[PDB]
Design a binder for these strands. Structure first.
Lengths: 456, 589
RNA sequence: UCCGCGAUAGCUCAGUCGGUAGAGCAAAUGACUGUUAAUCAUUGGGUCCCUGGUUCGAGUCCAGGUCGCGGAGCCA
């Protein structure tokens, strides 16, 4: 069996004003408060394309290494639904913003596979229907919100690969600063065009378009449970029909919302209100200079030049802020493995305490840089790390013995707790080093050997 | 050879020697005196050992927990300062003449009686030592007493205990059937019955005048708390009887049962119509322990400035009902907010209220933010109608009929229990006169129960206006819970065709869905009617148990599996092949 | 996807600003003549949910998983 799937991802761009309207984007519980005259599709009103919208569009186009057309025209997707005000969705039929690109997705089975993206054009969002009294309520607060429809080439195969692609898209978009990426608030959505086929015969099972898929887990489970379903369907023969299916995480079953009786004729044609936007090579010349370093290539840059493991490189390159924050400390000259080490474990705990969106807030790189500076040059490595670790990070912002004296401390400890009796069996002798370490803080490496020699 | 039961040692048997066998609950060693608590089906008793026969002492020191032993001794009357209230036999002891260890016992996973912190999964996994606990045993024995009483009554009244087959034919519409792959008929399945309904009807056709059966029932639905996949039901069906006779016999049964077992008496069961029940309680299963009642008041609040009242007041598809809670004006705003959020869960947009403090001053005598939009006269006749006086609070539910009925009905029961406003006696009832039809979301008409339910009117008044038709159906309610219910069936040709015509079902579906039934109905079916009780819940009520699993010997969890026998389990591929079926747990990349 | 809580002896459950898994109950041995959910002393027992990583050292800190309860979100 060979399962050929596809992915249609809608990404909500983080722009202040809407794509054609002047209303804000992020909204609260207040309904119809984020809707001017343009969004309500009043008769005689006209739309004007947003600047940072197309900017971010061709930005994603440049990041994904796709052949961007010099000209792109907005077309109309005429369909009737209460959420859609003007009766047509302003999309792009011919000549999209970006087309034919490739994204390197990193999985766990060795090779980081290359996936195709056929296009990524600019769309617009519609209203939302809610559960209420009777009739129903439509809110146009999200209507008019700029959307980026990243359509992937059907080169993507297994479900795990699909999850990898969604995560790669999410990561790239997070790095570019185009969308929030937070699927919980409803910014990033996707659909899956899954179709299976028996290897050998050019005949195959009917296409299944699973719409409205939230989490990555939901993606994997739904895609699997759809693949196996199609496998059964073709094995039995029966009736292979093209349908619009849905997935609920509660029962892990796939239900059909609408049966596709025929190809929906949306009647596409160039919008007479919107003139074709011309993207000249100068825009791309400046924006490519503005292009940030890709995460997929950032972890690999963490593999090549800086001594690091795949794991630590990936988890360090999980975000741009953390990456830059770490690279500064490396710039201090703190040992790569050890500087990164300090970034991971120690400050990571306090970062887990508040989980502060940006690591620009809690601790500066110059401070930890100064700590490692004190640990390397000014002082030797060992116990000096342990206390400053406690004191320096939380509160104050201000920046070692190796004698024989510890032996004199080693006797009194044995007198404190009844340690003389516990010496009989080997077990663990950490409790012996505890009292000495607490009394001194000094020099653990010597203390372990001395305590081990003194025990039995 | 046992002489007497441990938990049946009264004070009267003093000066008699006894031999009793049982388990060793707990053992107390004082050195000079050894105490053993021996337990059987009837309860616990204390046996005492003094080393004056040190051989028995040797057979006393080795004994540990849950050892199965046989002890013969003499019952000695214990001192006044040693008497035990917890032990039913706890005013006497038995000095052990001779002991014998019938069988040894490994350490029981969990302890008996509280506050031994067993958790439900562990208690279910070792259910065979859990039922040793006297409380569980008392519950099950009580169940046995119940089935005993019911069987005695039904037998004495000319009912026939006849068994109906479990493996029957599968059919949709009603509920998911448990299927059983057929070894002899490949591709075909048997099905576990949801109720012996069809079979009992056939038994009426078969000439058996009166039938009853305590039958096993199976539903493959996702389950609720207090709901199990395998549940026992008391099926009853009779011929040549109307609704009055059936309700008579059944009511008599319930009374006789409650007097035989718990020794309580029920007077008479009030017959309340569905319409009335919905009117003053907003529920098809009223809790008659709570005297609090819903009173409709929307008619006088039609042309009023306040709009959340006037809205549904002029809308026929709903009402505005009030609920007086007495002496509850001292209630804090916290509780009010909690209750508003509570009624929120049943769909009510808001819970309006009036705190009634001083009636002679009018409007300045009613502290509330709503009082301004409503005239003084209407207010006064409302207060007059609801029965409210000084010190009370009046709540208001104003919405679609279903929503207000459910939300205020539940607010009613909730605030009913929370303020302890009920009489603690038993309160039984009958719910009668249901409607025949209802709309089915999309439209059209449909029967709530079954299309075989007898309407109170004629097939003409029926084909006239189907909405005005009441059914001859009946449910029995105790403490606001539905013990069971049934109805008298239709055996009339023209009537069956009348309800068939009125529901939109042509003869295709008539034949495909009910053909064998209609066939059996055509060859001379008598006037028959029946009812069924959920025996489990009945025992649950009669015991006072919290859950239904407490009145079932070996229950299953909410996900239909039982943790003790680890069922359902895996079966080898051979038995899978012989039954003509395949699995589909195949490896994916 | 997200928030809170939780996984640690037979059972229940605690464990700080990182140093031999404790306590009640149960079990084993011993003591005690009135307990009755006995007590007291002593002994025995366990993979701190899985993997990887951090540190002189991990139940504890970092990252990624599994499972139970409830809440939020989505359901063009």
């Amino acid at each position: 069996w060979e399962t050929v799937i596809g992915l249609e991802i809608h990404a909500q761009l983080a722009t202040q004003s809407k794509i054609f309207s002047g209303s804000s984007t992020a909204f609260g519980a207040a309904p119809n408060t984020q809707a001017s005259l343009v969004d309500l599709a009043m008769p005689g009103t006209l739309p004007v394309l947003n600047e940072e919208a197309v900017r971010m569009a061709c930005l994603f186009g440049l990041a994904i290494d796709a052949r961007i057309d010099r000209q792109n025209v907005f077309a109309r997707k005429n369909y009737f639904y209460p959420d859609l005000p003007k009766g047509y969705q302003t999309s792009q039929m011919d000549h999209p913003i970006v087309g034919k690109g490739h994204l390197d997705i990193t999985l766990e089975d060795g090779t980081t596979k290359r996936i195709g993206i056929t296009r990524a054009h600019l769309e617009e969002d519609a209203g939302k229907s809610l559960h209420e009294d009777g009739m129903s309520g439509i809110d146009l607060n999200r209507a008019g919100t700029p959307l980026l429809e990243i359509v992937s080439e059907p080169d993507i195969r297994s479900a795990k690969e699909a999850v990898a692609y969604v995560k790669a898209i999410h990561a790239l978009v997070r790095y570019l600063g185009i969308c929030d990426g937070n699927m919980a608030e409803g910014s990033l959505r996707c659909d899956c065009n899954v179709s299976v086929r028996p290897k050998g015969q050019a005949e195959f099972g009917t296409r299944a378009e699973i719409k409205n898929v939230n989490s990555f887990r939901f993606i994997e489970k739904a895609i699997n449970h759809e693949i196996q379903r199609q496998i059964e369907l073709i094995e039995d023969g029966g009736k292979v029909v093209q349908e619009t299916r849905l997935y609920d995480p509660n029962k892990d079953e796939t239900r059909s919302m609408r049966g596709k009786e025929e190809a929906n004729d949306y009647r596409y044609f160039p919008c007479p209100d919107l003139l074709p936007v011309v993207i000249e090579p100068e825009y791309l010349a400046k924006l490519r200079e503005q292009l940030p370093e890709l995460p997929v290539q950032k972890r690999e840059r963490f593999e090549s030049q800086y001594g690091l493991s795949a794991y630590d490189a990936s988890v360090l390159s999980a975000s741009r802020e953390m990456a830059d924050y770490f690279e500064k400390v490396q710039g201090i000259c703190g040992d790569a493995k050890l500087a990164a080490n300090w970034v991971m474990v120690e400050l990571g705990s306090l970062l887990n305490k508040d989980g502060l969106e940006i690591e620009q807030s809690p601790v500066s790189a110059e401070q930890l840089g100064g700590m490692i500076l004190r640990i390397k040059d000014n002082t030797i490595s060992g116990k000096l790390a342990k206390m400053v670790f406690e004191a320096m990070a939380n509160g104050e912002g201000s920046a070692x013995x190796x004698x024989x004296x510890x032996x004199x401390x080693x006797x009194x400890x044995x007198x404190x707790x009844x340690x003389x009796x516990x010496x009989x069996x080997x077990x663990x002798x950490x409790x012996x080093x505890x009292x000495x370490x607490x009394x001194x803080x000094x020099x653990x490496x010597x203390x372990x050997x001395x305590x081990x020699x003194x025990x039995x | 050879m046992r002489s007497h039961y441990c938990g049946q040692l009264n004070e009267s048997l003093d000066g008699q020697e006894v031999t009793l066998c049982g388990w060793v609950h707990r053992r107390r060693d004082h050195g000079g005196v050894i105490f053993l608590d021996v337990r059987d089906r009837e309860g616990l008793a204390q046996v005492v050992f003094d080393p004056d026969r040190a051989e028995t002492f040797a057979k006393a020191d080795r004994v540990r927990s849950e050892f199965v032993v046989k002890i013969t001794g003499k019952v000695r009357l214990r001192p006044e300062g040693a008497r035990n209230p917890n032990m039913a036999s706890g005013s006497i002891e038995v000095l052990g003449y001779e002991l014998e260890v019938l069988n040894q016992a490994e350490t029981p996973p969990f302890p008996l009686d509280e506050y031994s912190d067993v958790g439900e999964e562990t208690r279910l996994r070792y259910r065979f030592i859990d039922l040793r606990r006297p409380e569980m045993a008392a519950k099950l024995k009580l169940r046995a007493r119940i089935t005993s009483s019911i069987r005695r009554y039904l037998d004495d009244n000319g009912f026939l205990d006849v068994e109906t087959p479990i493996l029957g034919r599968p059919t949709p519409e009603g509920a998911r059937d448990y299927l059983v792959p057929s070894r002899t008929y490949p591709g075909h399945f048997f099905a576990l019955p949801q109720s012996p309904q069809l079979f009992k009807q056939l038994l009426m056709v078969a000439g058996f005048d009166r039938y009853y059966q305590i039958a096993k029932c199976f539903r493959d639905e996702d389950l609720r708390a207090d709901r199990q996949p395998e549940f026992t039901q008391i099926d009853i069906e009779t011929s040549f009887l109307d609704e009055s006779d059936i309700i008579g016999i059944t009511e008599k049964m319930v009374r006789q049962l409650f007097k035989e077992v718990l020794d309580v008496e029920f007077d008479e069961f009030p017959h309340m119509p569905f319409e009335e029940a919905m009117r003053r309680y907003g529920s098809d299963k009223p809790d008659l322990r709570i005297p609090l009642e819903l009173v409709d008041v929307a008619d006088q609040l039609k042309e009023v400035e306040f709009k959340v009242f006037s809205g549904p007041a002029n809308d026929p598809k709903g009402r505005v009902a009030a609920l007086r809670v007495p002496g509850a004006a001292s209630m804090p705003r916290s509780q009010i907010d909690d209750y508003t959020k509570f009624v929120g869960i049943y769909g009510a947009k808001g819970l309006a209220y009036i705190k009634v403090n001083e009636r002679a001053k009018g409007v300045e005598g009613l502290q509330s933010p709503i009082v301004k939009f409503i005239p003084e006269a209407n207010l006064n006749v409302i207060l007059d109608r609801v029965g409210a006086v000084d010190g009370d609070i009046v709540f208001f539910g104003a919405d679609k009929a279903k929503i207000v009925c459910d939300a205020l009905g539940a607010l009613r029961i909730k605030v009913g229990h929370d303020l302890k406003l009920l009489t603690r006696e038993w309160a039984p009832m009958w719910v009668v006169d249901f409607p025949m039809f209802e709309e089915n979301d999309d439209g059209s008409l449909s029967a709530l129960h079954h299309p075989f339910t007898s309407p109170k009117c004629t097939p003409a008044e029926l084909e006239a206006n189907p909405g005005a038709a009441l059914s001859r159906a009946y449910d029995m309610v105790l403490n606001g819970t539905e013990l069971g219910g049934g109805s008298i069936r239709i055996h009339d040709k023209s009537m069956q065709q009348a309800v068939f015509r009125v529901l939109g079902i042509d003869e295709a579906e008539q034949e495909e869905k009910f053909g064998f039934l209609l066939d059996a109905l055509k060859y001379g079916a008598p006037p028959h009617g029946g009812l069924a009780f959920g025996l489990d819940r009945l025992v649950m009520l009669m015991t006072g148990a919290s859950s239904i699993r407490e009145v079932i010997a070996f229950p299953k969890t909410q996900s239909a599996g039982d943790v003790m026998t680890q069922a359902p389990g895996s079966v080898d591929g051979k038995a899978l092949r012989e039954l003509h079926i395949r699995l589909r747990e195949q490896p994916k990349a």
